[PDB]
Design a protein around this ligand. Structure first.
Ligand SMILES: [Ba+2]
Length: 615
DNA sequence: TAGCCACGCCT
DNA sequence: GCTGAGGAGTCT
DNA sequence: AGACTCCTCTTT
DNA sequence: AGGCGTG
């Protein structure tokens, strides 16, 4: 462990995936050997590879490579990696567009000149398109350009794409069990370790649980490769959207929409369809559906609202993939029909079916009910009685609103510089709550985590723990997390409800002491300032409330994890607390948020929206 | 749709 | 658009 | 000269 | 004011 941080982290990944019997079925021998080859390198040889694996994939000037901590002179090390088959040298640098790319605009000028036919000025981009048109006609002069371009660029290494590929697939796999260590790190461009992972994994200590895998996710190394392909596609589409190239993204999508209807009969699907949901998210079909969702987003941006409706109706026609997404869809469907396609007939059928789908929850549920009333009680609609149709009167109860002012300067205010939220925490200090946290959902989530820790990492649920560095059972964000643990859950949620404020102070003390540091997705250790703070807070919150919140989180974290209030403020001595949703000059309450506030009131908790106006 | 935010537009 | 901080190279 | 784009390194 | 999009 004179291994620097980035190497320790890389090794954990390799180990974690290599000890999966199931995972190792999806690598041929050729592939498997490369890993051995890695392990065979010297410590130096390894350090340097990780560095370069992490760097962008392409050619690097030998003079641009400095790691003192690896060695003062890296030529030996490079030679090892070359011989090993991991790194290639300027010697294999053959493509012109590659040689040019590697050179600086300065150098590009020096070659634009010492070639008489070249206009020595313009951008770097131009001089390239130039030198490439020239070598394409008079080929024999092109080989002389390349000859110098090379000699001019210098000594240069590149990571070999082939072995690289194996490590990315390993990284990909590591990342399913770490939720998705990132779609951006693993799934796109190509796999590197996320920043946080690369830094911390080597030090991280995980909650103890029992690995118990009883089902395969992938049929064979082929299924993996098809999945990896869909993954990369979704990544490149998301990437396009991000860079605003909505035209490219529409193609890319349609492209993928073919391929998916191409796979729609293949043997493998039968088995995937059959997986429990918490695993079904790791299949081609799930990724293709996810892609089709982005596609309706794209149809929407390009304002093609008829198509988007078709696509939404397609997605909703099946319950196989992404059922957690139907709420987003039904809502999105209805919004399109009502707003954009003014078809008031379907808007109702839509809203009706949607609200009859036990799949839709919280925010979207509310948002459909709200459109219903706005619609039924509208004259532009009155010539009907098809929405009086027994709509359960989910009239989200009304909440105390409050307003304060702050001197404006994400929006920054002054009081020293601070946030909308910090400004309010102040108003509340002078309102006689000496104590507060700005924690949004993590305050509550880590309390749920502290109180149910042992039930979460409980033994006896097949398939939820598949390997070594999990921070949660894979079914955590499913309807099955609760069903698979009903009896234990009902029991614990009851105890908590009746617990007096010392049993709580004690249960928390317990987990805290036994688990402090351990990486669990629900628990932020620095979220409270000390164990003592946590105990204060639970004391104020009290069982019935602590129970109610925990019940929602475990029952349906997927759809309840967001829209809890920004602030918790309590009075130390008086034990009175308030749950505050800060609303700066430019944001209102989302449906998710008005559900939470309602539900927190029912639990009998002081809830308040605190509007901030600027000066 | 990951969720957030600031802005801007329409009604 | 954003989800971090600094430096080197490119652009106009 | 200054603005912006790209890339790397983070830690223990 | 609030519903909706855009980046
Ligand atoms: Ba807020």
């Amino acid at each position: 462990t004179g291994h620097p941080y980035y190497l320790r982290s890389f090794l954990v990944v390799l180990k974690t995936v290599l000890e999966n019997e199931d995972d190792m079925l999806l690598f041929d021998e050729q592939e498997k050997g490369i890993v051995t080859k890695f392990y065979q390198l010297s410590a130096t040889g390894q350090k340097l590879y990780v560095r370069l694996f992490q760097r962008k994939l392409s050619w690097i000037k030998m003079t641009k490579l400095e790691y003192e901590e690896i060695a003062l002179d890296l030529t030996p090390v490079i030679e090892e990696l070359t011989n090993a088959g991991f790194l290639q040298t300027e010697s294999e640098l053959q493509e012109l567009s590659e040689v040019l790319e590697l050179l600086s605009a300065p150098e590009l000028k020096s070659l634009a000149k010492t070639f008489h036919l070249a206009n020595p000025n313009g951008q770097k981009q131009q001089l390239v398109d130039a030198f490439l048109k020239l070598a394409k006609q008079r080929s024999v002069i092109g080989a002389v350009i390349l000859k110098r371009a090379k000699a001019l660029a210098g000594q240069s290494v590149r990571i070999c794409k082939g072995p690289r590929a194996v490590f990315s697939r390993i990284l990909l796999l590591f990342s399913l069990t770490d939720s998705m260590e990132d779609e951006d790190a693993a799934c796109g461009g190509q796999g590197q370790l996320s920043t946080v992972l690369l830094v911390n994994l080597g030090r991280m200590e995980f909650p103890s649980y029992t690995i118990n895998r009883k089902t395969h996710i992938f049929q064979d190394r082929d299924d993996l490769i098809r999945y990896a392909a869909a993954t990369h596609m979704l990544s490149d589409i998301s990437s396009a959207m991000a860079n605003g190239n909505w035209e490219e993204a529409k193609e890319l999508a349609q492209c993928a929409k073919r391929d998916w209807n191409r796979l729609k009969n293949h043997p493998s699907l039968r088995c995937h369809e059959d997986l429990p949901l918490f695993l079904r998210c790791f299949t081609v079909g799930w990724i293709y559906t996810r892609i089709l969702s982005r596609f309706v987003e794209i149809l929407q941006r390009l304002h093609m609202y008829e198509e988007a409706v078709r696509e939404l109706e397609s997605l909703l026609s099946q319950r196989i993939y992404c059922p957690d997404s139907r709420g987003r869809w039904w809502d999105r469907l209805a919004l399109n029909l009502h707003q954009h396609l003014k078809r008031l007939e379907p808007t109702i059928k839509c809203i009706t079916e949607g609200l009859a789908d036990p799949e839709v929850r919280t925010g979207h549920r509310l948002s459909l009910y709200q459109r219903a009333v706005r619609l039924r009680e509208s004259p532009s609609c009155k010539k009907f009685k098809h929405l009086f149709q027994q709509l359960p009167e989910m009239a989200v109860q009304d909440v105390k609103h409050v307003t304060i002012t702050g001197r404006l300067c994400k929006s920054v205010f002054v009081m020293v510089l601070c946030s909308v939220e910090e400004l309010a925490l102040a108003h509340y200090r002078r309102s006689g709550f000496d104590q507060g946290i700005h924690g949004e959902g993590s305050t509550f989530s880590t309390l749920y985590g502290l109180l149910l820790w042992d039930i979460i990492f409980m033994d006896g649920i097949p398939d939820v723990f598949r390997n070594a560095c999990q921070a949660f059972p894979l079914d955590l964000c499913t309807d099955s997390f609760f069903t698979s643990r009903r009896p234990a859950l009902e029991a614990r949620l009851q105890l908590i409800h009746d617990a007096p404020e010392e049993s709580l102070r004690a249960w928390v003390a317990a987990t805290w002491h036994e688990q402090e540091g351990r990486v669990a997705s629900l628990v932020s250790w620095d979220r409270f300032t000390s164990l003592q703070q946590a105990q204060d807070l639970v004391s104020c919150l009290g069982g019935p409330v602590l129970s109610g919140v925990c019940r929602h989180l475990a029952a349906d974290f997927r759809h309840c994890r967001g829209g809890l209030p920004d602030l918790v403020v309590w009075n130390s001595q008086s034990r009175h607390f308030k749950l505050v949703e800060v609303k700066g000059p430019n944001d209102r309450l989302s449906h998710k948020q008005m559900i939470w506030l309602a539900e927190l009131q029912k639990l009998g908790a002081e809830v308040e929206v605190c509007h901030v106006v600027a000066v």
